[PDB]
Write a protein that binds this ligand. Structure first.
Ligand SMILES: CO[C@@H]1O[C@H](CO)[C@H](O)[C@H](O)[C@H]1O
Ligand SMILES: CO[C@@H]1O[C@H](CO)[C@H](O)[C@H](O)[C@H]1O
Lengths: 277, 271
């Protein structure tokens, strides 16, 4: 019997993007007459499978999985859900149902923006390489730079937090001087802005910075952050609608893509003294 | 084998999200699952969340939703026999676990007065929230202990953008030397408004936030703020719920202390 309850397994809610995704899923679910029951998990098939079985024991109608998973591990989670519809929001190419922001396009937009402004010395601050999302953003950056015959001047790895963005940017400035930094999320970009400011490098006159997500606070960073927007409202609307559609007509697995956009604010400019005035 | 149900307000605000994470951490260490229901404002929405969580057959409930005690009584009534703990209620009911609701306000006023400020503005949370109201009342009362009135009182909605807009509004009407802000997200917006207005922080305007949510040490400048230890709140609330499940003896409210974390956003007033 249907219960009008959707189960949501989610990675660390202390990161801003997953919490905005929960909020957007709850909002659409409420408009569609569904309650949402949320389980927060750590990495691993076992942690995800345990979350699924408990929800299925309490008769949830369908599941949404927002946890970073590689191909094989995503297949194992999908398998555990039995015949309950299940959707994934953070997976590599996998034979599973997914609703994804285009992982390569966000990286491409960031490189193209900086290259068009004239930058040639671009550093990359990735997320944790255990994350499929962080890996695909890194690969997209490297590939798009190579299409312009550029190599990144530095590549460092953070953990999605602001403090890691600060620490990795400080380390980057010990080894070289980029004119622009691509950062894999907005929280790390906040820490990079702090490191640049406290090192006497003005943003964007001396160093440009691009974030990723457009989480809510970023329009109020100093300076307001230029970033790749992932519209979490639309993700929440789309996933809840795809789950309702999967309850009515059980269908083959499909990967579905949502657009990303570059939001131009106040952290990018041409490289220092290209247009000295 | 055991599951805790957690009702929470909007997870897009950083403090409730850190509280969820802290509750999940302690619950997992004690072998318990946590299932979460997100609530809009009001007693009806909280009752609906409680009913959803009871339908998950949970063993106990933790409510992190700002409630007047009369509505908390109605929410407790909807829990029935299932033990329930509140994290944001005034008057603080029996069994509850909550941060001291006035100590943070007192510490912030006392710090700015100790630095020599006399022209202190307040940027409150939404007065619909018990926590925002108690912080406002605490600020006013501590200022009155120094024979001061706030030079301005502005009202935000807990978001950074509201901190920006309210700080721009405040600067259209006057010029304080210090600003007490009811949370760190609004303080971020306040810093942006001061910076873009050409008011140096802290040399011309001092700013104090509230929460010490994770990003705040990386604001420009790093934010002086009232720390609410959300790790300790999660640990203590789960421990108290377990004690209630083991022995239903009702316990006095437990008030957790808060502290001032001095970073880089305060200084004496421009003389
Ligand atoms: C939605 O994708 C990514 O999710 C991560 C957590 O797994 C981080 O929150 C990143 O900021 C976000 O870009
Ligand atoms: C924990 O108390 C308060 O909760 C609010 C939401 O209800 C906001 O998140 C505030 O920042 C926080 O200080």
């Amino acid at each position: 019997k249907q219960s009008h309850t959707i189960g949501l397994a989610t990675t660390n809610l202390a990161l801003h993007a997953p919490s905005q995704i929960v909020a957007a899923i709850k909002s659409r679910a409420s408009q569609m007459g569904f309650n949402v029951v949320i389980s927060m998990v750590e990495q691993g098939v076992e942690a995800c499978k345990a979350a699924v079985n408990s929800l299925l024991a309490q008769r949830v109608d369908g599941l949404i999985i927002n946890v970073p998973l590689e191909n094989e591990d995503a297949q194992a989670v999908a398998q555990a859900c039995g015949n309950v519809p299940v959707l994934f929001l953070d997976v590599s190419p996998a034979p599973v149902n997914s609703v994804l922001f285009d992982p390569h396009e966000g990286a491409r937009l960031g490189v193209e923006h900086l290259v068009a402004l004239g930058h040639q010395r671009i550093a990359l601050l990735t997320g944790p390489l255990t994350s499929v999302s962080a890996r695909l953003r890194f690969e997209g950056w490297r590939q798009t730079l190579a299409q312009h015959q550029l190599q990144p001047i530095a590549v460092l790895h953070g953990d999605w937090s602001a403090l890691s963005g600060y620490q990795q940017t400080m380390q980057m400035l010990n080894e070289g001087l980029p004119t622009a930094l691509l950062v894999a999320n907005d929280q790390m970009a906040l820490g990079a802005l702090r490191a640049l400011s406290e090192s006497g490098l003005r943003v964007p006159a001396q160093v440009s910075v691009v974030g990723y997500d457009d989480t809510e606070d970023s329009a109020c960073f100093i300076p307001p952050l230029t970033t790749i927007k992932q519209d979490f409202r639309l993700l929440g609307q789309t996933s809840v609608n795809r789950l309702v559609q999967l309850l009515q007509n059980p269908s083959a697995q499909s990967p579905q893509l949502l657009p990303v956009t570059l939001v131009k604010r106040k952290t990018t400019a041409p490289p220092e003294n290209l247009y000295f005035q």
